[PDB]
């Protein structure tokens, strides 16, 4: 709601309440009925003491009968149509500064005139003074960059706060606290559960010119703050720490570039940036044995590698993992591998060597079908450089994973289907530094060279289908905290989020209404059973007890796996179908990156 204005005689009377509206196209008259919504502030910088900046709450809350300043929206100044109003008194707990910044908000869920009847919830700030452009600001960090991992963020039953700010009630002189101060709180709340490190900063302090202010997270040091992460230093005392009362000293120590260096990983970064492996070509026989080609490099200046790795030093760990079968997801739960480090080359020269991965299997009628590679290693570093693996204090580094596809005769580019992508993981986890078994972190494919169809599930388990280690239903079932082993796990987003994940097949979202080659295993242990396709996926994130199975063609457990594969095509999905229908996609929560 872009407004006008400061009411400077001798109360706060904002005087408009419009138009950037809830959800529209826009640019249209609204009417304010009939809900909520207000609340003051003053910030003063670093005045009191010698540390930052502080917003400080003006009365506003809960009442019984309807009121002007204070929160709810009725016995007010005189509101309507656009331009509103209105607050009582002034400077309540804190008090009003000549030449000094204030804030003001405003929230609209609606049970509405009977003219429309919306929204849920929609806020908006204006940073006000007394009759100048803008002193200084507090300008930290807006809520967009919060939603990657939140899709959207609501907090208080959603009343707040779609994007800034709730440093309004979190400050000393509204909350009791303690400490639900907004830097000292969200850092300690994230402190665990975070998918990436604690230490990546920009995941939250985002860069951007709109906030001028910060340049903040290492250019003001401050016990709150700091030591919401570093919980086992008590400042005050010298537990852990050398002793401080308060920060008027922290600075003069905790230099700018110290502070954002010591949570920097740019040393890791530059040490990996000089090293690559690919794999320069491929190719398999009929009975099922690969003939790889893998080339060592600086990606950086791009010269080769001249040795193998077997001779490289500085290489901790270095694998191939292959399996066949793009078009069904593959052949086998376990793929082949080699470790290269581990083993002297059939052939090579000049920073590229021949290997062959063996043991593959080849089912008959899937001979011009397409396979799958992975590399994955470690690389000892030390100060930004790497360095052999014996030496003191070297750490040990993980290579980003990365997966080329595999054909008969030699590499192809199509490969087996893109689900998601690490693009899409990353907005949560990063990219790509979410490791598991080690070394392996590559999303958009390698998991599933060992996560597909061929991981049994149990069928004794009242669970439908969540004890499948196929990586779609890993996935659907851990970040539900319904998984095995994965309970009490809090997921920040929203479930029902498809596009947080999901991506484009060209057209609609990857989950389209009828899947391309999705074999469908979903029922082993206990092996003879199997069950419908479409179902299979479905029955994680609409569970038990249910559905009926409301079970129309195709959908069932067992049936000769041939009832169960596909069987033919059925209406589960014409009903539930991607063109206009009455569901597809309209039924999930999806929005855009
Ligand atoms: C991904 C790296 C995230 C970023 C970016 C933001 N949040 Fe988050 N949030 C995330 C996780 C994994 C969790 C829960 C972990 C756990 O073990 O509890 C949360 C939780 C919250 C909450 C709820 C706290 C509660 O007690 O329920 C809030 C209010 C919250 N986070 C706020 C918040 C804000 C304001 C962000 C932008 C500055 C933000 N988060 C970013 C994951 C991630
Ligand atoms: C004033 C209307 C507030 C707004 C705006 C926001 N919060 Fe709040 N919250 C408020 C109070 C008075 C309290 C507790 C008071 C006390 O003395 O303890 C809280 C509490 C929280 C908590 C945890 C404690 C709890 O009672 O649940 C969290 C995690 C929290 N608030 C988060 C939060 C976020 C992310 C906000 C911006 C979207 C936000 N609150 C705004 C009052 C107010
Ligand atoms: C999302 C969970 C964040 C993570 C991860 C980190 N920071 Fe943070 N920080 C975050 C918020 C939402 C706020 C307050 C926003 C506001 O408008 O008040 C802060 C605050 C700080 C501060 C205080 C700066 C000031 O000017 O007072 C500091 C010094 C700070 N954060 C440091 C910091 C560092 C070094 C981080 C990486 C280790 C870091 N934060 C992570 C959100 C999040
Ligand atoms: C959570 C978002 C944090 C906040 C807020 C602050 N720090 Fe931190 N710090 C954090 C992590 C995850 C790490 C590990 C570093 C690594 O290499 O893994 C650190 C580390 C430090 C250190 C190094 C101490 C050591 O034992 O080697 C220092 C000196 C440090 N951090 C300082 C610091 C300051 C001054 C902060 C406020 C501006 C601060 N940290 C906030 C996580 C978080
Ligand atoms: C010089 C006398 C300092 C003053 C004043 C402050 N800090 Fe400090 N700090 C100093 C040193 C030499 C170190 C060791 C770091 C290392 O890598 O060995 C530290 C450590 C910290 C840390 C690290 C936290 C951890 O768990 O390791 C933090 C978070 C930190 N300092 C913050 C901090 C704060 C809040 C200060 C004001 C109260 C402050 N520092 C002052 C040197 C000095
Ligand atoms: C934010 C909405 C997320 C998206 C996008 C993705 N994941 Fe996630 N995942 C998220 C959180 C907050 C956590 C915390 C778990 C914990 O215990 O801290 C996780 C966890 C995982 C794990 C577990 C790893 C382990 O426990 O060792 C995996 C393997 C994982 N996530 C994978 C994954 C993939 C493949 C994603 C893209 C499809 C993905 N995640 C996105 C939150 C979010
Ligand atoms: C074969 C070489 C595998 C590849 C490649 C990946 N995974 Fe894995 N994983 C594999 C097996 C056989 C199992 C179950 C039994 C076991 O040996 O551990 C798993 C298990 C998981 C789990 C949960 C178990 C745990 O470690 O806590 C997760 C979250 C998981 N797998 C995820 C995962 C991801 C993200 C992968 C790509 C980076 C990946 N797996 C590859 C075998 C294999
Ligand atoms: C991150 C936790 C995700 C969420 C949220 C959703 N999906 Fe997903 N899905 C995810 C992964 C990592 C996979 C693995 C598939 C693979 O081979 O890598 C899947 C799989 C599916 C599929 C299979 C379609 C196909 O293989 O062609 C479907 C149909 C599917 N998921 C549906 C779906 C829907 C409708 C979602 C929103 C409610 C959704 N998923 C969320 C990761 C994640
Ligand atoms: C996890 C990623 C899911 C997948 C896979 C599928 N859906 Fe889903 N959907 C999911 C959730 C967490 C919810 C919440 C529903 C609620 O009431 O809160 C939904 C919602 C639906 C519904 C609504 C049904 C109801 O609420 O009674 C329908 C009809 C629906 N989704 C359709 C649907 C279909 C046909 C799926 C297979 C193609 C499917 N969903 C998969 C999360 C997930
Ligand atoms: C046309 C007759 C359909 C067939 C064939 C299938 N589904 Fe369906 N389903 C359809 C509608 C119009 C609805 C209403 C949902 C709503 O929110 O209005 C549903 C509902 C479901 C649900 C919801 C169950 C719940 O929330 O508890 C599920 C889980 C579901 N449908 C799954 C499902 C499966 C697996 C199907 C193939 C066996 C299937 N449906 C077929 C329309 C139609
Ligand atoms: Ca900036």
Redesign the pocket.
Request: aromatic content about 12%.
């Given at each position: 709601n872009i407004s006008v204005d400061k009411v400077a005689i001798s109360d706060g009377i904002a005087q408009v309440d419009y138009q950037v509206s809830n959800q529209e196209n826009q640019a249209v008259v609204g009417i304010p009925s009939a809900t909520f919504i207000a609340a003051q502030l003053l910030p003063q910088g670093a005045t009191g003491a010698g540390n930052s900046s502080e917003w400080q709450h003006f009365t506003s809350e809960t009442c019984a009968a309807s009121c002007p300043g204070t929160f709810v929206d009725h016995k007010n100044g005189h509101y309507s149509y656009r331009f509103s109003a209105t607050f009582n008194g002034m400077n309540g707990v804190t008090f009003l500064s000549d030449a000094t910044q204030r804030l003001v908000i405003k929230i609209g869920g609606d049970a509405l005139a009977d003219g429309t009847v919306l929204p849920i919830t929609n806020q908006h700030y204006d940073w006000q003074s007394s009759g100048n452009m803008l002193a200084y600001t507090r300008n930290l960090?807006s809520?967009d960059?919060?939603?990657?991992?939140?899709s959207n963020?609501a907090?208080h039953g959603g009343r707040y706060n779609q994007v800034e700010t709730?440093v309004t009630c979190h400050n000393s002189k509204k909350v009791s606290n303690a400490a639900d101060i907004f830097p000292q709180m969200?850092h300690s709340?994230?402190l665990?559960?975070?998918?990436?490190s604690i230490s990546?900063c920009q995941?939250?302090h985002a860069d951007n010119p709109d906030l001028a202010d910060r340049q903040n997270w290492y250019r003001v040091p401050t016990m709150e703050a700091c030591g919401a992460c570093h919980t086992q230093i008590n400042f005050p005392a010298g537990q852990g720490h050398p002793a401080q009362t308060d920060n008027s000293n922290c600075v003069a120590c905790h230099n700018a570039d110290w502070t954002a260096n010591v949570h920097s990983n740019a040393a890791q970064t530059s040490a990996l940036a000089q090293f690559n492996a690919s794999i320069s070509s491929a190719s398999m026989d009929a009975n099922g044995t690969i003939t790889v080609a893998v080339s060592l490099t600086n990606p950086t200046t791009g010269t080769a590698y001249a040795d193998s790795a077997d001779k490289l030093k500085f290489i901790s760990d270095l694998r191939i993992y292959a399996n066949w079968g793009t078009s069904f997801d593959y052949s086998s739960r376990s793929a082949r591998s080699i470790r290269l480090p581990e083993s002297t080359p059939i052939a090579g020269s000049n920073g590229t060597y021949s290997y062959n991965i063996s043991g593959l299997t080849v089912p008959a009628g899937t001979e011009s079908d397409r396979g799958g590679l992975a590399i994955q290693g470690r690389v000892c570093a030390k100060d930004s450089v790497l360095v052999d693996c014996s030496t003191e204090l070297a750490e040990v580094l993980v290579i980003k994973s990365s997966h080329s596809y595999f054909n008969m005769s030699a590499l192809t580019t199509t490969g087996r289907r893109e689900v998601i992508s690490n693009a899409k993981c990353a907005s949560?986890h990063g990219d790509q530094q979410l490791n598991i078994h080690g070394a392996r972190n590559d999303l958009a494919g390698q998991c599933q060279l060992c996560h597909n169809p061929n991981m049994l599930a149990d069928a004794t388990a009242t669970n439908p289908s969540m004890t499948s280690f196929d990586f779609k239903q890993l996935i659907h079932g851990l970040h539900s905290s319904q998984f095995a082993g994965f309970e009490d796990?809090?997921?920040?987003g929203n479930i029902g989020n498809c596009a947080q994940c999901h991506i484009n097949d060209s057209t609609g979202i990857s989950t389209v209404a009828l899947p391309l080659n999705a074999a469908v295993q979903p029922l082993a242990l206990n092996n003879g059973t199997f069950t419908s396709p479409i179902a299979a996926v479905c029955s994680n994130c609409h569970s038990s007890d249910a559905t009926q199975n409301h079970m129309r063609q195709q959908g069932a457990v067992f049936a000769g796996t041939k009832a169960d594969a596909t069987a033919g095509t059925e209406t589960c999905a014409f009903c539930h179908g991607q063109g206009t229908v009455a569901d597809v996609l309209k039924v999930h929560p999806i929005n855009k990156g």
């Open positions: 960090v809520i960059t919060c939603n990657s991992c939140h963020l907090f709730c969200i709340k994230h665990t559960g975070f998918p990436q990546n995941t939250c949560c796990l809090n997921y920040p």
